Amino acid sequence: VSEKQLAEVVANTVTPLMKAQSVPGMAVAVIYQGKPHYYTFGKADIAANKPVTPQTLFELGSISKTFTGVLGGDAIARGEISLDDPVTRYWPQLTGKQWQGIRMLDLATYTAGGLPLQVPDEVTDNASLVRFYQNWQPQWKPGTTRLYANASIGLFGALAVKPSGMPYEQAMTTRVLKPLKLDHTWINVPKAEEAHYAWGYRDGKAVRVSPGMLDAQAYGVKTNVQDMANWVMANMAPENVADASLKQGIALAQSRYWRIGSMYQGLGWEMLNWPVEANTVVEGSDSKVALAPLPVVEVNPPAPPVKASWVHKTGSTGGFGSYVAFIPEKQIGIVMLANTSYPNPARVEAAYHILEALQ
Numbered sequence: 001v002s003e004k005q006l007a008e009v010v011a012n013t014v015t016p017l018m019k020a021q022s023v024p025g026m027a028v029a030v031i032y033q034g035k036p037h038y039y040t041f042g043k044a045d046i047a048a049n050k051p052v053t054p055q056t057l058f059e060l061g062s063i064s065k066t067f068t069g070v071l072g073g074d075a076i077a078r079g080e081i082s083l084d085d086p087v088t089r090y091w092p093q094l095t096g097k098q099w100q101g102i103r104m105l106d107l108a109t110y111t112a113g114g115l116p117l118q119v120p121d122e123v124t125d126n127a128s129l130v131r132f133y134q135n136w137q138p139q140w141k142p143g144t145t146r147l148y149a150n151a152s153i154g155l156f157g158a159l160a161v162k163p164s165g166m167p168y169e170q171a172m173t174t175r176v177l178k179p180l181k182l183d184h185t186w187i188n189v190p191k192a193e194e195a196h197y198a199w200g201y202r203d204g205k206a207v208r209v210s211p212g213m214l215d216a217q218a219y220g221v222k223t224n225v226q227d228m229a230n231w232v233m234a235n236m237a238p239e240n241v242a243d244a245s246l247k248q249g250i251a252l253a254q255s256r257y258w259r260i261g262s263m264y265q266g267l268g269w270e271m272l273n274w275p276v277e278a279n280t281v282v283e284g285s286d287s288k289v290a291l292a293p294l295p296v297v298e299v300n301p302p303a304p305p306v307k308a309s310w311v312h313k314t315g316s317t318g319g320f321g322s323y324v325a326f327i328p329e330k331q332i333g334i335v336m337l338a339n340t341s342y343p344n345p346a347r348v349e350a351a352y353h354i355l356e357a358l359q
């Protein structure tokens, strides 16, 4: 098992990291041999001398974007939605001529034409919301340029549940979390659960996520390390998913619809072929790349899930930092939850270390 050496990789990699970056509390999950190994460090709340714990809730950030893609995927599975219906079909109010050739896949994959990163703070209700989209002007034409945006995949998820009849929080729970037994994952932490909610730490000061349009769909979800480990396992070895639609939903989200040179876009998920050079992955996670308008080459039809990929996603909030990755061919993957926001390339460096040590 190398459980003794494996629990040594953990220590020897995150401890110099926590102090190198002033990290208060961290929680790690490794899935080596289909068995999750949790390791907890630092404090959840130093103000109250609370340490970190497997039940401890961290903010997931845009890693929530993965739930969206499967929420949306399981939905395609039921044949409620299709990856090519015009957006216009599930929300005919958008009457702007500019919206014409935009599909659901576009919104699902930052492909629509330059939809903003952040939804305007100015935007506070459905009418100002429809205004914004209706006024919006793409710089590029659909299916040509990929620019990572909340405004793109949020609305996708928002509409993606429409034919269900149940609001996002509902569907998301009823169709994904419960079946997968993710009984401590939260869009809205219960009062009874709040005790498990930690604090994020910014300019010395302590903060948490704050409400805003399409948040749930973009950075809502809050959960503990245990559930993150189960989440990962269901995505890596999906065959074991009891429910049919979900299983396919997991399929579809890891399929590949566009190519952005070295990487491949999926629903929520991001994938590089395995094996892949660390510098490649790490480099591409720097914000001078990740938030960049980059041309895109399409796969038609969308290649189905390839075993030998690096599928992953970074995620951040005001005071939180998270990161997940896992090579599905080689039964392993890791989970790093931190109550702080620190440089993406730093998260993915450390992972690689610990991960390629499992080989």
Ligand SMILES: *[B]([O])([O])C1=[C][C]=[C]C([N]C(=O)[C]I)=[C]1
Residues within 6 Å of the ligand: 060, 061, 062, 063, 117, 118, 119, 150, 218, 219, 314, 315, 316, 317, 318
């Ligand atoms: B995610 O990458 O962590 C992410 C992307 C875009 C925006 C957010 N958050 C907000 O705009 C509000 I902290 C998270």
